[PDB]
Amino acid sequence: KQKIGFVHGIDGTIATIAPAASKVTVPYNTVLEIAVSATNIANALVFNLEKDGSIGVILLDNISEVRSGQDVYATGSLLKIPVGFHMLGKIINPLGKEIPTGTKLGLVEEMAPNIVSRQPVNYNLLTGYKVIDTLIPVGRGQRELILGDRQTGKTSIALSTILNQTKVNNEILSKNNVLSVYVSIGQRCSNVARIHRLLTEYDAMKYCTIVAATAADPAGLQYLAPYAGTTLGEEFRNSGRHILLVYDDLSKQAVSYRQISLLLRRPPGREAYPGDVFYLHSRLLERSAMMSPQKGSGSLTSLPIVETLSNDVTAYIVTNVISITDGQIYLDAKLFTGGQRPAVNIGLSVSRVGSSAQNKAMKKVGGALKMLMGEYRKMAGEQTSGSQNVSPVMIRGARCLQLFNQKGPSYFMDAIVALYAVTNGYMDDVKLQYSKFYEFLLLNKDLPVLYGQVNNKYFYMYNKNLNYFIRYFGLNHEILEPELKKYIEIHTNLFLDNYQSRMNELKSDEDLVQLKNLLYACKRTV
Amino acid sequence: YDDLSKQAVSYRQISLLLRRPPGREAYPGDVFYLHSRLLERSAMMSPQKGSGSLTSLPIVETLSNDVTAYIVTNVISITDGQIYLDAKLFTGGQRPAVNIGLSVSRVGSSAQNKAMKKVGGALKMLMGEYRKMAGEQTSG
Amino acid sequence: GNITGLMQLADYTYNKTRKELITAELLEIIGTMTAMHAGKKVGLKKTEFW
Amino acid sequence: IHRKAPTLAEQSGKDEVLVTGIKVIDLILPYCKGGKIGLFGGAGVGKTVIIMELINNVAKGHGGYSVFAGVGERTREGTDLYLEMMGSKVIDLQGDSKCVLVYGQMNEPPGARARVAQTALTMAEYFRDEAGQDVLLFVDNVFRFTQANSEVSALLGRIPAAVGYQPTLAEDLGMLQERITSTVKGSITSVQAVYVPADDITDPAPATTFSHLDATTVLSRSVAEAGIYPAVEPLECASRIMDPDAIDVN
Amino acid sequence: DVKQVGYVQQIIGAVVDVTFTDSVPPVLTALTVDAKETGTLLTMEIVQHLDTKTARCICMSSTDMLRLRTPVVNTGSQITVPVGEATLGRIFNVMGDAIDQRGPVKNKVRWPIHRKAPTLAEQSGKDEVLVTGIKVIDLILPYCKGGKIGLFGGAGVGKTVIIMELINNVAKGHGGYSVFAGVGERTREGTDLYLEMMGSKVIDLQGDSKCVLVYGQMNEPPGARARVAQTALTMAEYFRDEAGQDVLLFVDNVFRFTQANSEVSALLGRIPAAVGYQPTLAEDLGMLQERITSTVKGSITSVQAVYVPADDITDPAPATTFSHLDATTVLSRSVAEAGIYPAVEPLECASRIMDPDAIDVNHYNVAMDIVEMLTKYKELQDIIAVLGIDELSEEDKLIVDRARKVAKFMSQPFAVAEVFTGMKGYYVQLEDCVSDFGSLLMGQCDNIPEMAFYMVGGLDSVKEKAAKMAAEAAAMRERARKAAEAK
Amino acid sequence: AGGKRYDLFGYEVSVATGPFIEEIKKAQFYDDAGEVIVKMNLANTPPDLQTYNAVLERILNCKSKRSQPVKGENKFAAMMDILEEMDARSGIKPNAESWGYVLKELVQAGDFRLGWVCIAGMKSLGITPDQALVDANEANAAKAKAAGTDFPAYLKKAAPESFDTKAWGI
Ligand SMILES: Nc1ncnc2c1ncn2[C@@H]1O[C@H](COP(=O)(O)OP(=O)(O)OP(=O)(O)O)[C@@H](O)[C@H]1O
Ligand SMILES: Nc1ncnc2c1ncn2[C@@H]1O[C@H](COP(=O)(O)OP(=O)(O)O)[C@@H](O)[C@H]1O
Ligand SMILES: COCCOCCOCCOc1ccc(C(C)(C)CC(C)(C)C)cc1
Ligand SMILES: [Mg+2]
Ligand SMILES: [Mg+2]
Distance CA E203, CA A183 (A): 42
CA separation for the pair D183, D171 (Å, rounded): 22
Contact of A154 with A344, CB cutoff 8 Å: no
| Closest C-alpha to A50, from E58, E17, E54, E33 | E17
Q: Which residues, listed in sequence order, are joined to residue A161 by a DSSP beta bridge?
A: none
**Cβ count near E401 (within 10 Å):** 15
- H/E run at residue D190: strand D187-195
Query: Within 13 Å and on the Cβ side, how many CA atoms surround A274?
Result: 26
Neighbour count for residue B139 (Cβ, 10 Å)? 3
Nearest residue, CB atoms, C18 vs list A267, A271, A314 = A314
d(CA E211, CA E214): 10
B19-38 burial, b at 16+ Cβ within 10 Å, e below that, comes to: eeebeebbbbeebbebbeee
φ/ψ of A373, rounded to 5, equals -80, -35
Measured distance CA(E437)–CA(E466) in Å, rounded: 17
DSSP for B11-34, please give it: HHHHHHHTT----GGG--STHHHH
Q: For residue A118, what are the β-bridge partners?
A: A291
CB contact under 8 A, A283 and E100: no
CA nearest neighbour of E68 among A6, A26, C33, A224: A26
Q: How far is CA E90 from CA A291, A335, A474, D105, E98, in A?
A: 21, 49, 41, 70, 7
Chain A neighbors of F83, CB-CB under 8 A:
472
CA distance D34 to D187: 4
- How many CB atoms lie under 10 A from the CB of residue D192? 30
H/E segment holding residue F54? helix F49-61
Q: How far apart are alpha carbons A479 and B89 in whole angstroms?
A: 65
All structural domains of chain A: 1-79 (no CATH), 80-352 (3.40.50.300), 353-526 (no CATH)
Separation CA D222–CA D209 (nearest Å): 22
CA distances from A48 to A74, A108, B56, D206 (A): 15, 18, 53, 32
Cβ–ligand 1 contact at A154 (below 6 Å) = yes
Cβ atoms of residues D11 and D182 within 8 Å? yes
Q: What is the dihedral of CA D74, D75, D79, D84, to 10 degrees?
A: 10
CA angle E138–E142–E145, rounded 5-degree value: 125
F120 contacts in chain A (CB < 8 Å): 479
D221 exposed, middle or buried (CB, 10 Å; 0-12, 13-18, 19+)?
Answer: middle
Q: Are F103 and F121 in contact (CB under 8 A)?
A: no
CA of A388, closest CA in chain E: separation in Å?
22
The reply to whether ligand 1 has any atom less than 6 angstroms from the CB of A156 is: yes
Q: How far is CA A323 from CA E280, E308, E411, F124, in A?
A: 23, 12, 31, 46
A positions 473-502 inside 8 Å of F (CB) = 473, 477-480, 502
Q: Which are the catalytic amino acids of B?
A: 106
Picking from E194, A120, E210, A297, the residue whose alpha carbon sits closest to that of residue F9 is E194
Which element (helix H / strand E) includes D71? strand D65-71
Nearest residue to A293 (alpha-carbon basis) of E195, F19, F40: F40
Nearest CA to ligand 3 atom 4: E352
CB-based contacts of D105, cutoff 8 Å, min separation 6:
D70, D72, D73, D74, D75, D78, D113
Angle, vertex CA E26, rays to CA E23 and CA E31, nearest 5: 90
Technique employed here was cryo-EM
Closest CA to A270 of A225, A227, A319: A319
| Spatial distance between the Cα atoms of A389 and A122, rounded to a whole number of angstroms | 40
d(CA A469, CA A380): 37
Resolution for the entry shown, Å: 4.3
Residue F104 has what DSSP assignment?
H
For residues A440 and A418, give the distance between their C-alpha atoms in angstroms, rounded to a whole number. 10
CA A455 from chain centre, in angstroms, equals 42
CA dist A426 and A418 (Å) reads 9
Which residue in E286, E279, E200, E216 sits closest to E252, CA to CA?
E216
How many Cβ atoms from other residues are within 10 Å of residue A331's Cβ?
27
* Set E45, E185, E237, E263: catalytic member: E185
In angstroms, the CA C1 to CA B133 distance is 20
Mutation target to probe the C interface, by most C beta carbons within 10 A, among E271, E311, E315 is E271
E strand or H helix that includes residue A440: helix A435-443
Which CA distances in Å does A270 have to A294, B56, C28, C29, E352? 42, 39, 12, 10, 35
The residue type at A404: F
Question: What letter represents residue A214's amino acid?
Answer: T
Cβ–Cβ of B17/E282 closer than 8 Å? no
Neighbours of D3 (CB within 10 A): 12
| Count of beta carbons in the 10 Å neighbourhood of residue D225 | 9
Nearest CB to E319 within list B22, B25, B63: B63
CB D41 near ligand 2, within 6 Å: yes
Contact state of E275 with C23 under an 8 Å Cβ cutoff: yes
Task: Give me the amino acid identity at E130.
Answer: L
C19 in reach of chain A (CB within 8 A) = no
Q: Does C28 touch chain A (CB under 8 A)?
A: no
**Closest ligand 3 atom, CA of B90?**
1
- Is-contact D35 D182, C-beta < 8 A? yes
Residues within 5 Å of ion ligand 4, judged at the Cβ atom: A 155
Domain ranges of chain F: 16-150
C27 Cα to chain E: minimum distance (Å): 9
Nearest atom, ligand 2, residue D43 CA: 22
Within its chain, how far is the Cα of E254 from the centroid?
Answer: 11
**Can you say whether the dihedral through the CA atoms of F10, F12, F15, F21 is positive or negative?**
negative
Question: Looking at ligand 3, which residue's alpha carbon is closest to its atom 11?
Answer: E322
Closest D-chain CA to C37: D157
Pick the closest to residue E117 from E289, E315, E335 (CA basis): E289
- Where in E13-155 does DSSP place strands (E)? 15-19, 30-33, 42-49, 54-59, 71-74, 80-82, 91-92, 110-112, 148-152
D49 lines ligand 2 (CB under 6 A): yes
How far, CA to CA in Å, does A220 sit from each of A12, A15, A379, E331, F38?
A: 12, 12, 51, 44, 36
Quick one: which of A440, A378, A326 has its CA closest to F170? A440
Atom 12, ligand 1: which residue's CA is nearest? Answer: A153
Measure the CA–CA gap between A495 and A518, rounded to whole angstroms.
16
Best mutation site among A132, A151, A335, A340 for ligand 1, i.e. most ligand atoms within 8 A of its Cβ? A151
Residue D242, ligand 1, Cβ within 6 A: yes
- Distance (Å, whole) CA E462 – CA E448: 9
Chain E segment 187-226 residues within 8 A of F by beta carbon are 194-195, 198, 205
CA distance B20 to B15: 5
Helix (H) or strand (E) holding A510: helix A510-525
Contacts of residue F10 in chain E, CB cutoff 8 Å? 198, 205
A85 vs D42: CA distance, rounded Å: 51
Closest listed residue to residue E23, CA positions, set E74, E88, E72: E74
User: A interface mutation test: which of D168, D172, D190 has the most A CBs within 10 A?
Assistant: D168
State the amino acid at position F149 in one-letter form: T
Distance D166 CA to ligand 5 centre (A): 24
Nearest to A410 by CA among A271, A239, A526, A284: A526
Active site residue A352: yes
Q: Determine the Cα–Cα distance for residues E185 and E253; give it in Å rounded to an integer.
A: 8
Both ends of chain A: CA-CA distance in Å?
A: 61
The CB of A259 under 6 Å from ligand 1? The reply is: no
Nearest chain F residue (CA) to A117: F9
CB atoms within 10 A of CB E274: 21
Ramachandran bin of B12, using left for φ above 0, alpha for ψ from -120 to 50, beta for the remaining angles: alpha
Pocket test for ligand 1, best of D243, D247, D249 (most atoms within 8 A of CB): D243
The DSSP 8-state label assigned to residue E116 in this structure reads P
Q: Which of E90, E145, E148, E159 is catalytic?
A: E159
The residues that bridge with B92 in the sheet, in sequence order, are: none
Q: Are C and F touching by the rule of 3+ CB pairs within 8 Å?
A: no
Q: Identify from C26, C36, C40 which residue to disrupt to test chain D contact, counting D C-beta atoms within 10 A and taking the largest count.
A: C36
Concatenated DSSP letters of F73-96 = --HHHHHHHHHHIIIIII-----H
Helix (H, G, I), strand (E, B) or coil at E211: strand
Nearest 5°: the CA angle F70, F75, F78 is: 100
Asked if B19 reaches chain C (Cβ–Cβ under 8 Å), the answer is yes
Of A358, A369, A367, nearest to A418 (Cα)?
A369
Instruction: Give the residue among A319, A280, A326, A282 at the shortest CA–CA distance from A303.
Output: A326
Residue nearest to atom 6 of ligand 2 (CA): D229
In order, the DSSP letters of A24-71 are: ----SSEEEEE-SSSS--EEEEEEEE-SSS-EEEEE-S--TT--TT-E
Chain B residue nearest residue C11, CA to CA: B64
